Amino acid sequence: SELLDSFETEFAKFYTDSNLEETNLQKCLDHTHEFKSQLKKLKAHLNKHIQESKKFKRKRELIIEKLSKSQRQWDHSVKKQIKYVSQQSNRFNKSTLNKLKEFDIDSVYVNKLPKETMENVNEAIGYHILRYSIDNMPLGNKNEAFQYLKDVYGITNKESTEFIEMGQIVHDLKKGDTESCLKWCSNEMESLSSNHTALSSLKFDLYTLSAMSKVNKELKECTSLFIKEYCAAKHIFFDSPLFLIVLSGLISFQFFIKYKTIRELAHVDWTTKDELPFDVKLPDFLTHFHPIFICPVLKEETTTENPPYSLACHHIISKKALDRLSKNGTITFKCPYCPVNTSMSSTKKVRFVML
């Protein structure tokens, strides 16, 4: 956006070129080097003159004058340059970094994590590191990577052998050999609980790659498909939960900051402690995990203690809402959405389940 452009334009003043190679202090260095140069030159002249003296009065006067003329120039130029460096630094700070202090992230941190649950934050980090950044580790052969992980990163979680084998077979596949992947797929095909269509497609991809610019795309597709199939087969998370949680936290930041403003503007009270007041909108691949039903009349989630009930013509409302509308099963009523009367012939607790 525009602020990033402001940073990028104000930062370039630190250097003295468009290529961003030379800083400002190089002027100080060159001035000092030049000063030493004429000091050396004037000393050699002094010696040529002394050895001769063993007309010259003016020849000595030039040396005397120059030897004090050079020092003043060096002093003047050097203090000027370091000042301009200091002034430029202060100007950059004031004109650039003072537009960021308005937002303090620490103000958002409410509902802090308990101090006794750091053994889980350090356990999810291990899973994420094992899942994603395992290929860069100098693990080498097996049965020593265990010691490497336990000593460097301190990773001692259950899902370790599977990830080590996965990394090894992926690295082997990266060299073009497809014996390991084919053998593993054929072995997995034997059981009566594996997704046969995905395994068959992966086998077809391996057969096409084995027959063979175009290879790189096929190699990447086969690698990604093997990753997905193996993660599904071994009952582990394809995407680490920590990544999804952080990605949700970003969006939650974006909406919270706004809610706090509407809080300072108009003073309102939210009396339900266990539920945060505002609302957050999440992408498609972060929502449909549990069946969520919001009652039309009460605008509240539906819980096992407040099961949903279906009316006469198959609308769905809460249980306490149906109790209130038809008081303890005494009178009848119509839907709050259509003119069809309803009685105690309403079906039992409807249960929503995601397939």
């Binding site: 050699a44 020849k59 706004k258 809610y259 509407i262 009270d269 709050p336 959405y337």
Partner: protein
């Protein structure tokens, strides 16, 4: 049931609607409203006073206009809105954002002259439908525009070689 009232007020707040509580009661307050574009009520700005009964979901809210608006089914001495959906065809399913954004423009775009609340407005609506627009613009001007809302509310020697 305060949860429904709180959720509806929060939904009103999180949008661009300007809501002002009175003594922070959370059950009665005021909402800013802007006229719909197409209708002659285009540049008008108004303020609504709403009050939510304690039995809110099953009892209709009380909504009125504190400014002045000309309309057959709207009072002139006050702003007592009168339409069936709020009065007798209210189901415990509509919301405050819903009620405003649906049935305030809905009533603005469909006056009914069978049994009006403003008799002179009904007579004008039945007679002419061309000068009614200039009247409404007129009354809007004298009682509720942006301004009215703002008001009421040397020799260089030679060269000697040098040592490394």
């Amino acid at each position: 049931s305060k949860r429904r009232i709180e959720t509806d007020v929060m939904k009103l707040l999180m949008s661009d609607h300007q809501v002002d509580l009175i003594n922070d009661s959370m059950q009665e307050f005021h909402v800013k409203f802007l006229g719909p574009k197409d209708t002659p009520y285009e540049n008008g700005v108004w303020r609504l006073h709403v009050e939510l009964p304690d039995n809110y979901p099953y009892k209709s809210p009380s909504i009125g206009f504190v400014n002045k608006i000309f309309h057959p089914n709207i009072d002139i001495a006050s702003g007592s809105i009168k339409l069936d959906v709020i009065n007798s065809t209210w189901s415990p399913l509509y919301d405050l954002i819903n009620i405003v954004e649906w049935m305030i423009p809905g009533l603005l775009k469909e006056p009914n002259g069978s049994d009006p609340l403003n008799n002179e407005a009904a007579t004008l609506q039945l007679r002419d439908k061309k000068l009614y627009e200039e009247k409404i613009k007129e009354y809007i001007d004298k009682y509720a525009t942006k301004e009215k809302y703002q008001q009421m509310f040397s020799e260089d020697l030679s060269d000697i070689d040098v040592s490394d």
